Amino acid sequence: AEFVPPPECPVFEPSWEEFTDPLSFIGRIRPLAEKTGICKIRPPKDWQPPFACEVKSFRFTPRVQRLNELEAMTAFGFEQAVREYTLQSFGEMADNFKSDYFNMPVHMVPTELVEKEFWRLVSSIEEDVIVEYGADISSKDFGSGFPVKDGRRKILPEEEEYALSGWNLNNMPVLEQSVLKVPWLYVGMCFSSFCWHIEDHWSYSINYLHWGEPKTWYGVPSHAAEQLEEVMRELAPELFESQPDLLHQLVTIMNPNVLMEHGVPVYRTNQCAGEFVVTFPRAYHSGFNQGYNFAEAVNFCT
Numbered sequence: 001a002e003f004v005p006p007p008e009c010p011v012f013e014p015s016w017e018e019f020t021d022p023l024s025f026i027g028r029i030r031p032l033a034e035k036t037g038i039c040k041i042r043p044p045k046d047w048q049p050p051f052a053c054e055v056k057s058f059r060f061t062p063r064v065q066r067l068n069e070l071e072a073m074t075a076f077g078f079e080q081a082v083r084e085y086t087l088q089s090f091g092e093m094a095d096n097f098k099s100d101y102f103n104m105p106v107h108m109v110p111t112e113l114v115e116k117e118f119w120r121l122v123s124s125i126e127e128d129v130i131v132e133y134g135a136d137i138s139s140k141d142f143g144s145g146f147p148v149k150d151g152r153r154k155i156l157p158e159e160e161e162y163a164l165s166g167w168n169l170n171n172m173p174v175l176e177q178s179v180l181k182v183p184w185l186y187v188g189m190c191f192s193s194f195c196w197h198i199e200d201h202w203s204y205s206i207n208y209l210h211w212g213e214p215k216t217w218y219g220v221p222s223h224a225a226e227q228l229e230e231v232m233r234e235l236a237p238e239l240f241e242s243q244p245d246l247l248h249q250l251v252t253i254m255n256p257n258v259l260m261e262h263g264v265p266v267y268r269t270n271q272c273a274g275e276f277v278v279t280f281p282r283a284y285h286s287g288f289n290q291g292y293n294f295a296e297a298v299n300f301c302t
């Protein structure tokens with residue numbers, strides 16, 4: 001009955017010589033990481049970029065997420081309106097929610113317990129849990145989490161190495177080669193989540209957790225992409241089974257154990273603060289946040 005955690009995805013701890021640039025490093029770990037869909041990269045201990053967002057003016061209006069909206073299928077539409085938070089007020093709400101839900105301090109809740117409870121609530125018909133996710137935040141609004149030589153914020157000399165680092169997500173190559181843009185920010189709370197999807201143009205994605213509680217990931221290697229899609233449309237509601245992929249993946253919520261029972265390989269990881277997660281081309285991924293955190297992500301091409 002309880003959720004069975006998938007096997008762990010690869011974690012790489014490159015030395016300073018192995019940490020030269022992401023594109024060269026990702027190309028070398030590709031033979032292994034492409035067979036798991038996702039991988040985690042822990043930078044050297046001394047690589048600690050400062051948080052360079054405008055915290056004083058950071059204001060956002062997160063989306064409302066009903067965990068059991070798909071199982072609730074079998075007044076609607078006015079359950080909770082989308083409201084504005086500051087970055088401080090969102091953290092107070094997030095910490096209060098998690099501590100009250102588990103009856104424990106937020107830092108004492110085991111990651112396995114949040115994981116087991118998240119997947120129970122997704123399929124629960126007797127308990128309706130509703131959370132919020134600050135998912136629509138462009139780095140052009142209040143600045144990137146990384147220091148950027150933009151001219152709209154002061155950069156200290158000890159922070160210039162991070163403004164010029166290849167692992168700064170603002171310095172990733174994003175232009176696709178053809179005959180014929182900026183990172184996004186994610187302010188999470190406990191149970192806020194994203195369902196199974198791949199990137200537009202089957203692009204890579206790189207994700208950095210600036211601070212906060214871990215972000216739990218699930219990934220499927222690209223060689224099983226068509227197997228996952230077949231399981232999805234087999235078990236999806238009939239009203240959504242015929243929808244185009246770009247629209248269907250707005251509601252492709254599925255317990256990883258269900259995919260594993262159908263033979264789909266799934267890997268998991270807990271991304272901690274200061275760690276990177278890379279998703280490979282056509283690697284389906286999903287996840288949820290363990291608590292109040294702040295992430296930055298961008299799609300890149302090779």
Ligand SMILES: CN1CCC[C@H]1CCO[C@@H](c1cc2nccc(C(=O)O)c2s1)c1ccccc1Cl
Nearest residue numbers: 135136137184186193194195197249250295297
């Ligand atoms: C791409 N759109 C640009 C602005 C924000 C974003 C809006 C939608 O967002 C994706 C997400 C994809 C994704 N991929 C990797 C990691 C995370 C994470 O939350 O850490 C996320 S969220 C998503 C997908 C399904 C369900 C919920 C969400 Cl929110």
Ligand SMILES: [Mn+2]
Nearest residue numbers: 197198199205
């Ligand atoms: Mn994604």
